[PDB]
Amino acid sequence: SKTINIRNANNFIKACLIRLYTKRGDSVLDLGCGKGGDLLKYERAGIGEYYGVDIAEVSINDARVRARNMKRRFKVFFRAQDSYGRHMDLGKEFDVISSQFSFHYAFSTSESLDIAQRNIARHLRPGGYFIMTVPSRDVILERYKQGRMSNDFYKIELEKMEDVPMESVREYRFTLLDSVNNCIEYFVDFTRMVDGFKRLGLSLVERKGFIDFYEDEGRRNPELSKKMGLGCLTREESEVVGIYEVVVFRKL
Numbered sequence: 001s002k003t004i005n006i007r008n009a010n011n012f013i014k015a016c017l018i019r020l021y022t023k024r025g026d027s028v029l030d031l032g033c034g035k036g037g038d039l040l041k042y043e044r045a046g047i048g049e050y051y052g053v054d055i056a057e058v059s060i061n062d063a064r065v066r067a068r069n070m071k072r073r074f075k076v077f078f079r080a081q082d083s084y085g086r087h088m089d090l091g092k093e094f095d096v097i098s099s100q101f102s103f104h105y106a107f108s109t110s111e112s113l114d115i116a117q118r119n120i121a122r123h124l125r126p127g128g129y130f131i132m133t134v135p136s137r138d139v140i141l142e143r144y145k146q147g148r149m150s151n152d153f154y155k156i157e158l159e160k161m162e163d164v165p166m167e168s169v170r171e172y173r174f175t176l177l178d179s180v181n182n183c184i185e186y187f188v189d190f191t192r193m194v195d196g197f198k199r200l201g202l203s204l205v206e207r208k209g210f211i212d213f214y215e216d217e218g219r220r221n222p223e224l225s226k227k228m229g230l231g232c233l234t235r236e237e238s239e240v241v242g243i244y245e246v247v248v249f250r251k252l
């Protein structure tokens, strides 16, 4: 593929995040786990338990095969359901709750976000972290004002002007080479997210852009760099990576 560097970067960034907030023996709840793309990362992190939840059953089964056919020291649990707009009660709490490239889907409606934020807080141990990587609304609107909304790797389209300005847009179309196709993405209303979480005991402890986060980490972990094979992305690839940001809330 022609997006390998972009996959390496994203996985790199995610691995570093996991390394930063997880510790040995931790219990992790992976929301929007997908096809278990982080099982290996967690295996290196030496975590003890892994629970993955995804709305799509086609991905869960893929995450099962992977878990089933891999050298892992942690117990896995998969469940296919809606963890954002449908009540969720798994029974136990977790030290770390991860939602990689998937939490923005919780912003479907006002109620959805609320349910989703409630589902996160009730499955998080006090002191526990909720790490995520979501698209940056600020970034996107700027590329919009610059007219540069795409390239050979991706494409984004906002909604129509009928009685609406930029700040009034709630969603957009995202297309990615060898990935989603005109997938409907919901903008992450940051302020509403913060307030909503703060109301449930979760505080904002980290918000950084993918590129900076990437550059900063790539310098502190040169080994994980060459290990995951990476270094110096083309500006064309940077645009795709630059769309996402890192956000972390902790249950004080």
Ligand SMILES: Nc1ncnc2c1ncn2[C@@H]1O[C@H](CSCC[C@H](N)C(=O)O)[C@@H](O)[C@H]1O
Pocket (backbone or CB within 6 Å): 014, 031, 032, 033, 034, 035, 037, 038, 053, 054, 055, 056, 059, 081, 082, 083, 084, 085, 099, 100, 101, 102, 105
């Ligand atoms: N309400 C919901 N509950 C759980 N997963 C959801 C969801 N809405 C969307 N998703 C999931 O969001 C995921 C986004 S992509 C998942 C990628 C994965 N975290 C990685 O790092 O590769 C998809 O697998 C999709 O099925």
